């Protein structure tokens, strides 16, 4: 029931006395079709072990995102280390207008109508961290109503 | 002199005439002062093919503007319908 | 009700004529900042009655000269 997407695989290296040792890294993201999203980053000498370590870490360290019906709640921004990221709630059925890693993370996030833009570095690890930070700090009308101590109708 | 006349603004073989108020030295489809309606000779049934603001037309005629032969025909056809 | 403007008097050396700095205050069309912009006008004055640094109130009239199409109505803030 948790849909799982790998974003990108990459071969890294490590130079030793014998020569170059190659390894593989895997960036996977999981989600429940709702606000529960979580990513993982595994690494091994072999690709199925790296995707399995990534899905293993992604199934835990899940994060909860207060969605609306199928879209966001307010235009939110997210940063991590190279990637300022803008995302915006959109009308019904305009699709996921997003780049690379953000399409996979919002698709398993269960969003369906976004207008996104990734500025800066588009490294999938940091931009998926920047989207996780943006969706995590996106706040609902209930949370702001309980916070300000007013009703939702007093907030409009 | 100032005149009241048609102005060919249509497709090919399917004309449509804006009845405008213009200085007669200007071009046909060119510079004009006031557009006082239209006429469609290929007007279908159940649509208007003639509409003239006769209060403005009588205002410019009170100013001394002349009327073309077809415009005076369309004023006749309005004053026969009404 | 007639349209009139005000401004400092820049120079008064030529007779029956003064130069008036009208300093309008417009917004920049791109950056949104409000920038003071200065406009010089040659103003006809009878009697050479104005001085430098004087505030004046002017109206637009028929062209008295080549560069002069403005005539004052009255003087405010005469002194330094």
């Amino acid at each position: 029931e948790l849909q799982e997407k790998l974003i990108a695989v990459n071969r890294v290296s490590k130079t030793v006395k014998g020569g170059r040792i190659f390894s593989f890294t895997a960036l996977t993201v999981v989600g429940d079709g709702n606000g529960r999203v979580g990513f993982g980053y595994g690494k091994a000498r072999e690709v199925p072990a790296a995707i399995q370590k990534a899905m293993e870490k992604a199934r835990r360290n899940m994060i909860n995102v207060a969605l609306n019906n199928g879209t966001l709640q307010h235009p939110v921004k997210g940063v991590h280390t190279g990637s300022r990221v803008f995302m915006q709630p959109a009308s019904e059925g305009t699709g996921i207008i997003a780049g690379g890693a953000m399409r996979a993370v919002l698709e398993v996030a269960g969003v369906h109508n976004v207008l996104a833009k990734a500025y800066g570095s588009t490294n999938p690890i940091n931009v998926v961290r920047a989207t996780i930070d943006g969706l995590e700090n996106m706040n609902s009308p209930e949370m702001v109503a309980a916070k300000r101590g007013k009703s939702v109708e007093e907030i409009l | 002199m100032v005149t009241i006349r048609l102005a060919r603004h249509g497709a090919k073989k399917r004309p449509f005439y804006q009845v405008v108020v213009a200085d007669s030295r200007n071009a046909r489809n060119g510079r004009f002062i006031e557009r006082v309606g239209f006429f469609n000779p290929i007007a279908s049934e159940k649509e208007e093919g003639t509409r003239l603001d006769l209060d403005r037309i009588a205002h410019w005629v009170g100013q001394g503007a002349t009327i073309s032969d077809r415009v005076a025909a369309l004023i006749k056809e309005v004053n026969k319908a009404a | 009700k007639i349209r009139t403007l005000q401004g400092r008097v820049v120079s008064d050396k030529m007779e029956k004529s003064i130069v008036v700095a009208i300093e309008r205050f417009v917004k920049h069309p791109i950056y949104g900042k409000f920038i003071k912009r200065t406009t010089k006008l040659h103003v006809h004055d009878e009697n050479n009655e104005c001085g430098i640094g004087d505030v004046v109130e002017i109206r637009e009239c028929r062209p008295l000269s080549k560069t002069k199409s403005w005539t004052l109505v009255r003087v405010v803030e005469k002194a330094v």
Binding site: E92, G93, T94, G95, I96, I97, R103, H112 | - | -
Partner: protein, 205 residues
């Protein structure tokens, strides 16, 4: 300006049936519907995200028989029109005349409905209409005219339409060989395998 080649090659590439043949004989009998066409057809490569957006748009095009410039203009119109863009895109494809002829079962395939339109066998509100892409407003009647009413392939297509599922938004009277486009269909009225958001994301780069 039409695709005239093999149709099951298209259904083999898309992987599913596109109803490009009448359905009398089973498609698994007429072709290997589970194998892509060509020499290297048995292999299934890891198809990319642009690949699945292309295969979805080529599915919907190869269903309705619409070329790319026209399917682009339908996207421009569906994005201009209010509401869901993909749903308006499907409502326009379902508003096509050769589709209404197929859904009423006057032609066995959408191509045969197209040929009846092109061969002046369809009257819309009494007037003969020759264009496949004529938009059909709601509360419109659409009939076989008198001369082509005595065709064999017409009542054979109505036989296969009785074998097929009845659309809710229409109301056909097979004796007079006419029908009535009552309303535009809902998305729930249509098929559920079409992912219209992949097309919107394709034309929304």
């Amino acid at each position: 300006a039409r695709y005239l080649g093999p149709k099951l090659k298209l259904s083999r590439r898309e992987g599913t049936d596109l109803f490009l043949k009448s359905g009398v004989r089973a498609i698994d009998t007429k072709c290997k519907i589970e194998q892509a066409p060509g020499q290297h057809g048995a292999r299934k490569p890891r198809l990319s995200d642009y690949g699945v957006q292309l295969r979805e748009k080529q599915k919907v095009r190869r269903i309705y028989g619409v070329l790319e410039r026209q399917f682009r203009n339908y996207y421009k119109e569906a994005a201009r029109l209010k509401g869901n863009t993909g749903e308006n895109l499907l409502a326009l494809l379902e508003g096509r005349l050769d589709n209404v002829v197929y859904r009423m079962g006057f032609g066995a395939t959408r191509a045969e409905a197209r040929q009846l339109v092109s061969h002046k066998a369809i009257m819309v509100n009494g007037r003969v209409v020759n264009i496949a892409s004529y938009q059909v407003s709601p509360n419109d009647v659409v009939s076989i005219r008198e001369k082509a009413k005595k065709q064999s392939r017409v009542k054979a297509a109505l036989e296969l339409a009785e074998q097929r599922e009845k659309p809710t938004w229409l109301e056909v009277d097979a004796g007079k060989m006419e029908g009535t486009f009552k309303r535009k269909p809902e998305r729930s009225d249509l098929s559920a395998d079409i992912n219209e958001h992949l097309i919107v994301e394709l034309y929304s780069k």
